[PDB]
């Protein structure tokens, strides 16, 4: 075997205030490829079937014909219960315009937060194929989001993901972004990313849902340069996707996970033996200098933690990160803390194309398990971290969603932004399927979480495929 021993992990809980960061190591990450098989043409899937998202039909419906929809989150509480209001289900999505001239892959800097609603508890025979979502439109008033950036030079602004907390009964945590780009789309000045809070009121009658408020935006967090990488340290830094939750182990407190980057100057040779995570005599180890020479120093993802410094939840303090992937992958996005069986699962999304040199894995969801919000997190499924990937041959090149390589599974980029719901249901959006780009919700799927491993449930729905955009409420608010 050419694949190394994975770095062991205890699941041990630390104090949330402790400077301890669990490492998603190269030796961990390399288990994905190790666990895989060389696909058997006509087979274009290397992944264990248990870790594969089933194939989404190319005839998928739009969520709305007039809107591009991608990152989505439900109406929820700090317990991650999904909430209906007066018999209505409510979701929030990043939205953009398909006919405004810009292509799907440049949608990001034009993103606005919209909402959709529909009646809860409708059976499949009465739900339309597109999930029956009614477009509510833009959640925030024009210009409310961009106020945070005062007078700075900018060539666009956008609203990026977070979460909705019913508590003005509704708090929308999200990422305000500002960009200053030239002709070629190079940064004149480093992008600005600020985790913000806007409060408003959901209202409904028998015929619709609507909101008021969200007029006054509260800036909460931007990178410090000590735990989380600033624009000045790295023009291509990431800082976004707040998930706000209560840890029952820590009442009187409210916490937040979010995507960050390790705070170093871009190009620093700052990876250690810890990030590689080999045993000394493992024949399949790697040399640190060899790894840093490959350019893996440009891949320095982390998941951060913050805690409310008041009851108002209007003031937040940074804690040390709870997970790094230094020299493994530059993106750990939309992190969430999922409570099951008295355990803590950290789920986070990542891209095949953001892996460091010498490491490889699919687009989809990665999971880690521990005894606390800050653990020596155990990477799920063979100490790999992969929970659920798009069907992918890791023995062939990635391609891109705008340029599909026909040596590669045409559904390698079929879904992204996997969000884990109560009972292990997973919602996501469709990126590329063959020539077609989605901007629409994927079929909901279901994973059975079983201690250190997970299984895609193929008895769920249509051989694992539930309804398009099936994001259901558990609880009335
Ligand atoms: Mg308008
Ligand atoms: Mg690669």
Q: Would the annotation count 333 as a binding residue? A: yes
User: CB within 8 A of 252, min separation 6: which ones?
Assistant: none
Say if residue 71 carries a ligand binding annotation.
yes
Q: Which ligand number lies closest to the CA of residue 137? A: 1
Burial class for 32, CB neighbours closer than 10 Å (0-12, 13-18, 19+): buried
> Considering just the CA atoms, what is the radius of gyration of the chain in Å?
21
Beta-carbon contacts of 259 under 8 Å, excluding residues fewer than 6 positions away, are: 238, 239, 240, 241, 301, 303, 304, 331, 332, 333, 334, 335, 348
**Element spanning 193, H or E:** strand 187-204
Residues with active-site annotation: 71, 333
What per-residue string of b and e applies to 376-410 under the rule 16 or more CB within 10 Å gives b? Answer: bbbbbbbbbbbbbbbbbbbebebbebeebeeebbb
The verdict on whether residue 240 carries a ligand-binding annotation is: yes
Whose atoms come closest to the Cα of 357: which ligand?
Answer: 2
- Where do we find the tokens 């409904």? 204
CA of 355 to the centre of ligand 2 (A): 5
70 is in an annotated binding site: yes
**Torsion 244-245-249-252 (CA) sign:** positive
Q: Does the annotation place 241 within a ligand binding site? A: yes
- Point out residues after which the chain has a gap (C–N over 2.5 Å): 167
Experimental structure resolution, Å: 2.2
Task: Give the Å distance between the CA of 451 and the centre of ligand 2.
Answer: 29
Instruction: Print the SS3 string covering 383-447.
Output: HCCEEEECCCCCCCCCCECCECCCCCCCCCCCEEEEEECHHHEEEEEEEEECCEEEEEECECEEE
Q: How far is CA 145 from CA 202, 222, 334, 371, 423, in A?
A: 19, 15, 20, 37, 34
Distance CA 263, CA 240 (A): 15
Nearest Cα residue to 3 out of 367, 278, 387: 278
Ion ligand 2: protein residues whose beta carbon lies under 5 Å? 355
Q: How does strand 83-84 pair with strand 475-476? A: parallel
Phi and psi of 113, rounded to 5°?
A: -80, 120
* Residue whose pair of structure tokens reads 């609507």 in the numeric block: 210
Among 368, 380, 371, 331, which residue's Cα sits nearest to residue 351? Answer: 331
* E strands, 46-186, in order: 68-76, 83-84, 88-96, 112-119, 134-138, 156-166, 170-181
- What spacing in Å lies between the alpha carbon of 16 and ligand 1's midpoint? 42
Distance 296 CA to ligand 2 centre (A): 10
Q: Where are the beta strands (DSSP E) in 222-375?
A: 240-245, 255-261, 300-308, 316-326, 333-340, 343-350, 364-370
Give, rounded to a whole angstrom, the gap between the first and last alpha carbons of the chain.
Answer: 54
Interatomic CA distance for residues 300 and 332, integer angstroms? 9
Residue 114: nearest ligand to its CA? 1
For residue 67, the CA-to-ligand 1 centroid distance in Å is 14
Q: Is residue 417 part of an annotated ligand binding site?
A: no
Polymer length in residues for the chain: 477
Q: Is 161 annotated as a binding residue?
A: yes
**What is the rounded CA–CA span in Å between residue 346 and residue 333?**
11
The total of structural domains in the chain comes to 1
Q: Looking at the CA of 143, which ligand is closest?
A: 1
How many whole angstroms from its chain centre is CA 450?
Answer: 21
CA of residue 153 to ligand 2 center, whole Å: 35
Tell me the sheet residues that pair with 160: 175
In this structure, are residues 177 and 158 in contact, taking their beta carbons and an 8 Å threshold?
yes
Q: Is 140 helix (H, G, I), strand (E, B) or coil?
A: coil
User: Which domain, by its residues, includes 39?
Assistant: 1-477
Q: In the numeric block, which tokens belong to residue 182?
A: 């030239």
Query: What spacing in Å lies between the alpha carbon of 382 and ligand 1's midpoint?
Result: 49
């Amino acid at each position: 075997s050419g694949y190394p021993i994975p770095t062991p992990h205890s699941g041990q809980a630390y104090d949330p205030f402790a400077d301890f960061t669990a490492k998603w190591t190269r030796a961990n990450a390399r288990q994905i490829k190790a666990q895989s098989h060389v696909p058997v043409s006509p087979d274009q899937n290397s992944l264990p079937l248990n870790l594969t998202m089933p194939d989404i039909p190319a005839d998928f419906p739009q969520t709305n014909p007039d809107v591009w929809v991608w990152d989505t989150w439900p109406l929820a509480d700090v317990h991650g219960n999904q909430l209906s209001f007066q018999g209505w289900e409510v979701i929030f999505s990043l939205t953009a315009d398909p006919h405004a001239g810009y292509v799907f892959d440049d949608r990001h800097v034009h993103a606005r937060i919209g909402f959709f609603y529909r009646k809860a508890g409708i059976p499949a025979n009465q739900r339309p194929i597109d999930g029956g979502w009614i477009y509510g439109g833009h959640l925030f008033p024009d210009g409310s989001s961009v106020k945070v950036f005062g007078n700075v030079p900018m060539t666009q602004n956008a609203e990026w993901s977070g979460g909705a907390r019913f508590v003005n009964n509704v708090s929308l945590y999200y990422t305000a972004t500002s960009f200053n780009r030239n002709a070629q789309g190079g940064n004149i000045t480093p992008p600005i990313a600020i985790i913000s809070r806007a409060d408003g009121q959901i209202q409904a009658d028998d015929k619709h849902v609507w909101f008021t408020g969200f007029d006054q935006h509260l800036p909460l967090l931007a990178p410090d340069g000590k735990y989380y990488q600033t624009g000045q340290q790295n023009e291509f830094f990431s800082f976004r996707d707040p998930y706000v939750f209560l840890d029952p182990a820590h009442p009187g407190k409210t916490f937040m996970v979010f995507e960050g980057n390790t705070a170093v100057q871009r190009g620093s040779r700052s990876c250690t033996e810890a990030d590689l995570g080999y045993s000394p005599n493992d024949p399949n180890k790697e040399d640190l200098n060899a790894v840093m020479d490959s350019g893996a120093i440009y891949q320095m993802a982390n998941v951060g933690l913050a805690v409310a410094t008041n009851d108002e939840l209007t003031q937040w303090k940074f804690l040390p990160p709870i997970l790094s992937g230094n020299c493994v992958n530059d993106q750990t996005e939309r992190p969430q803390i999922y409570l099951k069986d008295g355990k803590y699962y950290l789920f986070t999304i990542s891209h095949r194309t953001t892996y460091a040199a010498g490491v490889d894995g699919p687009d989809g969801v990665y999971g880690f398990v521990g005894d606390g919000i800050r653990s020596d997190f155990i990477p799920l499924n063979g100490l790999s971290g992969l929970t659920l990937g798009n069907p992918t041959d890791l023995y062939q090149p990635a391609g891109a969603p705008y340029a599909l390589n026909p040596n590669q599974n045409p559904r390698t980029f079929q879904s992204y932004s996997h969000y884990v719901m109560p009972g292990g249901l997973v919602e996501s959006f469709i990126d590329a399927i063959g020539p077609r780009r989605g901007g629409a919700l994927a079929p909901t799927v279901k994973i059975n979480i079983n201690g250190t491993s997970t299984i895609l449930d193929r008895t769920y729905g249509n051989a694992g495929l539930g309804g398009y955009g099936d994001i259901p409420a558990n609880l009335p608010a």
